[PDB]
Amino acid sequence: YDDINVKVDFILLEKNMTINELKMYVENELFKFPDDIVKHVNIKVNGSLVGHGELVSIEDGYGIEISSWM
Amino acid sequence: YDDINVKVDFILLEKNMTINELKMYVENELFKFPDDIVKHVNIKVNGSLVGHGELVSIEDGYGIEISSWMVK
């Protein structure tokens, strides 16, 4: 079983919004969100939520720090 | 039929790995994305790839500028 493969998703943000709302964002070429989402990244394995995450600035690039795990 | 509600995901990375490999992930660990990680966010609606965006800092907030959108 630990021989098989799964997909690990580092999800910056999930947000619910109408097809209408979504479409406004596509018109404005920008989704606009009030801060924070860099601190609260979620790490799901095909729906099952494993841990939390934080996007950090390191080595002249980016990385993730595992704030929570399960 | 546009006032219907849907689930949009802003996805930084999908890593395929064994549950064995997945064991090699621990708490307070630190991983290293590539440098194209903020410039290649995948935008998903109900699990469907509808485009790609770039994460930017803005005033008091963060936003995802859209670089490609794959549906109309």
Author numbering:
A (entry chain A): 221 to 290
B (entry chain B): 221 to 292
Task: List sentences quoted exactly from the publication behind this structure.
The 2.3 Å resolution crystal structure of Spa33208‐293 was subsequently determined by molecular replacement. The structure shows a SpoA domain that forms the expected saddle‐shaped homodimer with an approximate twofold rotational symmetry axis. Regions of notable asymmetry have high B‐factors, suggesting conformational flexibility accounts for major differences between the dimer halves. Indeed superimposition of Spa33208‐293 with T. maritima FliN (Brown et al., 2005) (2.18 Å RMSD, 126 Cα atoms), Yersinia pseudotuberculosis YscQ‐C (Bzymek et al., 2012) (2.09 Å RMSD, 135 Cα atoms) and Pseudomonas syringae HrcQB‐C (Fadouloglou et al., 2004) (2.40 Å RMSD, 133 Cα atoms) shows a remarkably similar arrangement of secondary structure elements. In order to gain insights into the interaction of Spa33‐FL with Spa33‐C2, the intermolecular contacts of the Spa33208‐293 crystal were investigated and revealed a dimer–dimer interface formed by an equivalent surface of each homodimer, comprising regions proximal to the N‐terminus, C‐terminus and β3‐β4 turn from one chain and α1 from the other. This interaction buries a surface area of 508 Å2 and is stabilised by three hydrogen bonds and hydrophobic interactions between apolar residues that are conserved with SpoA1 of Spa33‐FL and orthologous domains. In particular, Tyr221 makes a significant contribution to the interaction, fitting into a hydrophobic pocket formed by the interacting dimer (Val265/Val270/Trp289/Val291 and Ile239/Leu242/Lys243 of opposing chains). In contrast to the closed tetramer of FliN, the Spa33208‐293 and HrcQB‐C assemblies form an open lock washer structure, with the concave surfaces of the saddle‐shaped dimers being offset laterally by ∼ 55° with respect to each other. Indeed, a continuous spiral of Spa33208‐293 dimers is observed in the crystal lattice, providing a molecular model for formation of higher molecular weight oligomers by the analogous dimers of Spa33‐FL/C2.
Non‐flagellar type III secretion systems (NF‐T3SS) are essential for initiating infection by many pathogenic Gram‐negative bacteria. In particular, the protein Spa33 (SctQ), which is essential for secretion and localises to the base of the S. flexneri NF‐T3SS in situ via association with the basal body (Morita‐Ishihara et al., 2006; Barison et al., 2012), has been proposed to form a substructure termed the cytoplasmic‐ring (C‐ring) (Morita‐Ishihara et al., 2006). In this study, we show that alternative translation occurs to generate full‐length Spa33 (Spa33‐FL) and a shorter C‐terminal fragment (Spa33‐C) within S. flexneri, with the production of both being required for assembly and function of the NF‐T3SS. High resolution biophysical studies demonstrate that Spa33‐FL and Spa33‐C associate to form a minimal 1:2 complex that then undergoes further oligomerisation to produce elongated arrays.
